[PDB]
Point group: D2
Chain length 121, copies 4
């Protein structure tokens, strides 16, 4: 799925995920969020299963974005964890964890959880 | 916290996380899990906030492991999302999402969620 | 939203959630899952915000199902946490945690996480 | 575990959970949080597996709190999902989802996720 994954993907929020999949399992690219304390592109990296099961199963993958770039710093990181499902309407179906840096006293409220679905259109 | 983060960390399961923090926000290294469908080391990559708040707050970070290496392939990926808290007993406090590749019919049961706390000892 | 919430709801898996909302914040009813180790109806209970904000915001709510009834026992419980959004196409948008009873050694893999969207049709 | 569960439990934040376990799987009680937009006690309800496995496994359970009482309304609900582990130092080990009522535009940031461990002392 190196070919399948590589490219430009869009989620339900209107965010844009630009990724390259390496033959060795790497994911590199940029993320631009349509929401939150974010502007322009941010580095991302991740990993995917470069030899998935041949049985109909999706391809596991994940990636991280730390919310610092030359424009802003939102003192946070999101990780998406999910699977790529190939075919006529290819999708990446993810769940994510967004942890902000907090004091000890606020750690209980440090982590948001949600779900993003990415499509090629 | 490039110095703070860089090195060998151990969680409550007895897993070993070996990371280098780059000046530019990169995280690279290897993960070896004490549990699950896993043996030996697996590549990991991630990101962290290289200019955290100076107010007492932790440092946001995350990383991914796809569960494929030369020994096995568990057709899955974990993402940890959390924060580094520096000082006498430094910690990385994380929550994680483990997504397995599944068919459409099994997607509902694709994703495990838990929490790992990493220490230097 | 006592009137709004009360009734029969269906999710994207084809599961059926039958609830009564009490004036005092109670949720009582039955759940029947279309997937998993489940058959027929199972008791559920929960709570919702009986005096929500008047600003356009959704109405917070949650409920639990333990997966035991007269037919089976799957030694697990799901909690859904989410919000009711009223209007022409009313929805309940949830995220859920399914914890199985496990030994200590398997606790790391005890908890599934997903997301369900319920509609009146 | 009706006897095991029933009573007063305390988490790592200093919150107090007072529960009765019914023979039929019910959980009823009150929760008082040490943190957040909360004061005094709030109703809770939930469910647990009243006939757990005899193999060493924990007992699955969950409960909800909507954050409305006579003192305040934080327009939110938490669900804890977890397991009771009996014996010399009994514990309830949970993960939780806290959903706030939000507008559509803020739904992405509606849900916090964390983990609480409850003890009898
Ligand atoms: Cu295989
Ligand atoms: Cu700052
Ligand atoms: Cu209000
Ligand atoms: Cu059994």
């Amino acid at each position: 799925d190196e070919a399948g994954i590589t490219g430009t993907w869009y989620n339900q929020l209107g965010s844009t995920f630009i990724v390259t999949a390496g033959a060795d399992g790497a994911l590199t690219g940029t993320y631009e969020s349509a929401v939150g304390n974010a502007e322009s592109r941010y580095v991302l990296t991740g990993r995917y299963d470069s030899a998935p099961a041949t049985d109909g199963s999706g391809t596991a993958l994940g990636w991280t974005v730390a919310w610092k770039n030359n424009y802003r710093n939102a003192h946070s990181a999101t990780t998406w964890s999910g699977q790529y499902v190939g075919g006529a309407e290819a999708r990446i179906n993810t769940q994510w964890l967004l942890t902000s840096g907090t004091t000890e006293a606020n750690a209980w409220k440090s982590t948001l959880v949600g779900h993003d679905t990415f499509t090629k259109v």
